[PDB]
Structures are given as structure tokens and as C-alpha cells.
Amino acid sequence: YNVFPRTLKWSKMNLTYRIVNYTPDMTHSEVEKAFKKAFKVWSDVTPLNFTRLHDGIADIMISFGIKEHGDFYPFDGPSGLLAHAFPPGPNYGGDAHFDDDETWTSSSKGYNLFLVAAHEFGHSLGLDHSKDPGALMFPIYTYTGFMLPDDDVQGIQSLYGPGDEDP
């Protein structure tokens, strides 16, 4: 027999993601690089591996949408809500949605896609919000010109372990 896990997390270390569609604001390459770097934040400190799929069903489906876009969390136009992601699980579990009424960038302007994605992927992997104002998982956007803060390291490692501690 098996009882359910005590904590919510992926039961496998190999995860896939798919960029379903793209924001007008950035090139396809810029978007891909931002998401690749955001996953690397987490894989660098765990045994997790992330592989991109171009099509089909991935664990973490990524999309840009506005207003009502297929879930119970409609976006709200410019400002306010920026993005959200679902905790590990089937279907919408793990998926990350970005409000395409925001301006997404690879700079300090607008909202930096890499930084927001790194936060959202923390949710995709099983972290909720942190009370440390300096944590990536703190629930308000700040721009930083990357080192994953220790609170986030401790949180993600509590779920998945550290992987190789010196890679």
C-alpha cells in the first residue's frame, strides 16, 4: 500500500515544460532564455532536471493570456495581478500563466520576465510565499540587477534535497 506524500511536490526529478505561446513584448529567444534561466535557479540547488518540449503535454505548461484565460484566476488588465502558477499536480498543476496586459522585459523596465518566472516556478515546484522581504518567494515584485536567497534554498531543498552540493 501507499499513503499520500506528507508534503506536496513532484514525485519525479525529471520535469518538462512547454512555452505554449509568447508575449508580443520580447523576442522568442529572449523569452526562452528568461524561462531557461528561471528553471536553472531551482535546478542548481536541487536534483531537479528541466527539459523543454516544443509541443504536446508537459508537466509545466507556460502561457501568456489576458482577462479570462481558462481557470479560476482571471487577470485584471494592466498593473495589479502579474502572473500566477499552480502547485504540483495533474492538469493545471505546475502550470504558469503571465498577464499579457503587462509589459514583460529582459531589463529593469516593466516587469523582468526572468525574475517573475523564477518566483512562479517556485510555486510550480511546491513553495508558497515567504515572510522574508529579501526572498524570491516574497509576495511583492522587486527588481534585482542572480543569487537565490537562502530562505528559498532552504525551502526548495526541504522538498527535493540539494542534489550535488558542489556541482
Ligand X SMILES: c1ccc(Nc2nc(CSc3nnc[nH]3)cs2)cc1
Between β-strands 111-112 and 60-65, what pairing exists: parallel, antiparallel or unpaired? unpaired
Site stretch for ligand X (CB under 6 A), options 39-47, 60-68, 93-101, 113-121: 113-121
Least distance to Na ion from the beta carbon of 101, Å? 6
Site string for ligand X, 116-135 (x = CB under 6 A): x--x----------------
Of the two residues 104 and 153, which places its CB atom closer to Ca ion in the complex? 104
Q: CB-based contacts of 8: which residues, under 8 Å, 6+ apart? A: 87, 88, 89, 126
Based on the shown chain and the rule CB under 5 A, indicate whether residue 80 belongs to the binding site for Ca ion: yes
Q: Which does 73 bind (CB under 5 to 8 A by kind): ligand X, Ca ion, Zn ion, none?
A: Zn ion
Using CB atoms within 10 A of its CB, is residue 48 exposed (0-12), middle (13-18) or buried (19+)? buried
Ranges within 60-89 binding ligand X (CB under 6 A): 82-84
Q: CB-based contacts of 26: which residues, under 8 Å, 6+ apart? A: 34, 104, 105, 106, 113
Based on the shown chain and the rule CB under 5 A, indicate whether residue 71 belongs to the binding site for Zn ion: yes
Q: Which residues are annotated as a binding site?
A: 25, 59, 69, 71, 76-77, 79, 81, 84, 91, 93, 95, 97, 99-100, 102, 119, 123, 129, 137
Query: Which residues of this chain interact with ligand X, rule CB under 6 A?
Result: 82-84, 115-116, 119, 136, 138-142
